[PDB]
Each structure stands twice: as C-alpha cells, then as structure tokens.
Design a protein around this ligand. Structure first.
Ligand code: HEM
Ligand code: HEM
Lengths: 145, 145
C-alpha cells in the first residue's frame, strides 16, 4: 500500500520536490512555523491535537510551537533525502506514521496539511505543479495511516 | 537545568561537533544503524524498550530498525543545525525529550548512547576529544528528562 503510493513519485515529481525543497527547507524555522500557523488558521479544529503546545496564537514566540515546527521540517528533510531509494523512503514514512496512528490521526485529517503547504509554496512563488508534487508525498504517509 | 547545560556548549565544543558530524552525518543510514546495533550489543538491557522493532539482531535487514536509525540521525542533524541559537536548541531538545519521558526513559538510561557514539567516532578517526564534545551535547538532553 505504502509501496504503491510511492510508485506515484515519478522522476518529474521527485525533481519538483527536491527543487522546491531547496528553498522551503533553507528556512526550517520560518517556513515550518508558517506551515503550522496556516494549518491552525484554515483548520481551527486541528488545534485540538496540540493542547500540549499551549497558546499557539503566539506563533514563533511560542517555544513549544517553534520547537515542534522545526522538528517537523526535519521529517520532510528525511523524506526528501530518501526519494531515490523506495525501500528507505517506506521504512521512514512508516516510522513517522506510528506516532500519528497512536494519536488517532486519520488519513483525511492528515491531508489537511496540503492547504498550508500549497500556500507556503506560493509565498515562495511555486505554482500548482509543485503543490501537486507535494500532495503526492503526503499521500505516501496517508497510505500508512 | 537544560538552560545551564546548553550554556556548556562553548565555542570549541561546537566546532568539534560540526567537524565530526560533517563526517558522521554523511552516512546517516550506515552510522545510524551501527549506532543502534552497538547500543544493543553493549547494553542488552535496553532492548526491552524497542519491542516494536522486532528482531533487532537483523540489523540493516530489519526495516523497522532501519527506519528508526535513520530518523534518529536526523534528530542529531537538527541539534547540530541549532547550535548557533541556544533558544532554538533548547525548544528542540525539550521537544525530543517529551516522547522519551513518556516512555519512562531516565537521564541515566539515555546516557548509555555515549558508549556507542564514542565507538562510531573512533571507527572514523575521531578520538576522546570529540567523544567528550558529544557527551556534552547528550547532557543537554539528559537535563530535560
Ligand atoms: C507534513 C505532515 C506532517 C509531518 C511531516 C509531521 C511530522 C511530525 C513529527 C516529526 C513529529 C514529532 C515526532 C512525533 O511525536 O511523532 C510530529 C508530532 C505531532 N504531529 Fe505530526 N506531522 C505532520 C502533520 C500533522 C498533522 C496534520 C497533525 C494533526 C492535525 C499532526 C499532529 C501531530 C501531533 C499532535 C504531534 C505531537 C505534537 C507535540 O505535542 O509536540 N501532525 N509530527
Ligand atoms: C542520540 C540519542 C538519541 C536520540 C537523538 C533519540 C532520538 C529519537 C527519535 C527522533 C525518535 C523518533 C521519534 C519518537 O518516537 O520520539 C526516537 C524514538 C525512540 N527512542 Fe530515542 N533517541 C536517542 C536515544 C535513545 C535511547 C538511549 C533510548 C533507550 C534507552 C531511546 C529509546 C527510544 C524508543 C523506545 C523510541 C521508540 C522506537 C519505536 O517504537 O519506533 N532513545 N528516539
């Protein structure tokens, strides 16, 4: 299942992920927090999963939130670095999914991160072409949930 | 406290962490697994915490262990990248600590990673000078458990 979703990561899709990531991933703190704040803004309900973070409206100034956002970017950094070896990409995606399964986060719920990503990509001038590429990466994780 | 431990990361200590990581962090999969396998060999008692990984003796062949080992290396990557800003290094360390606290991993238990790190370092021509620099870093996390 996860392997089949990985099959969707074609040569062109991978090229767009590595290219857009060369920019998005150059500022993990900034872009990471931008992602989380956009998620909470567009889907206020997802906040119910982050009670441990406290006052998330403080954004960047919130140490717990900032700490979480930076760590999230390194998960994506991990996935991007494993794009050329489906075997490693899968074992890594399944590792990440473990804790989200325990948190009772469905695939549909996880998919809500697509909007935030699309917006963050556009702030850097990356059109739908890149947005679709990333939706395919998120789909690999969703296949594991 | 974690804040006083982070202050222990002096100029030369940070330089030694960067120089050694430049080599170690080159092969995250290889060194990551060597690290986990050495831990299980020198401290069989810690194996009980990794029941989910299955037969840990399979090493590289065990997909779960490989997924875990790689991800671990990205956590170290994260720490290294935050050495410039103590504030960010702290929120990132406390973040990682959370799940370990939930697993009831004590500071003393966590410190057992120092042995494996020293060995991997030596296998790459990095002696006591660097092993101690990493022990300092590890202590930062120990101060948050
Ligand atoms: C691009 C997608 C995402 C990535 C790469 C990602 C990555 C991570 C990582 C690496 C962690 C830290 C390790 C762990 O505890 O599992 C984490 C924590 C967490 N994630 Fe995800 N995540 C993503 C999306 C989401 C979404 C959409 C939700 C829920 C709406 C979610 C909820 C959580 C929660 C509740 C935590 C714990 C936060 C805390 O209390 O510190 N994640 N995630
Ligand atoms: C360099 C030292 C270490 C670092 C940076 C580190 C980092 C991590 C990371 C990033 C994860 C994945 C995310 C999560 O589930 O929280 C993890 C999982 C875990 N860590 Fe640590 N860890 C280290 C040492 C240890 C030690 C010494 C133990 C045990 C004595 C330990 C026990 C665990 C366990 C049981 C898991 C869950 C594995 C699973 O079920 O997949 N860790 N660690």
């Amino acid at each position: 299942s996860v392997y089949d979703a990985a099959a969707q990561l074609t040569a062109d899709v991978k090229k767009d992920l590595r290219d857009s990531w060369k920019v998005i991933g150059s500022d993990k703190k900034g872009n990471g927090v931008a992602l989380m704040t956009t998620l909470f803004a567009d889907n206020q309900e997802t906040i119910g999963y982050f009670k441990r973070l406290g006052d998330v409206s403080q954004g960047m100034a919130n140490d717990k939130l900032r700490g979480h956002s930076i760590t999230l970017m390194y998960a994506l950094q991990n996935f991007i670095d494993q794009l050329d070896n489906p075997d490693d990409l899968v074992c890594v995606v399944e590792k990440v999914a473990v804790n989200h399964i325990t948190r009772k986060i469905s695939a549909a719920e996880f998919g809500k991160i697509n909007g935030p990503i699309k917006k963050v990509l556009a702030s850097k001038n990356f059109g739908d072409k890149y947005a679709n590429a990333w939706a395919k990466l998120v789909a690999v994780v969703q296949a594991a949930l």
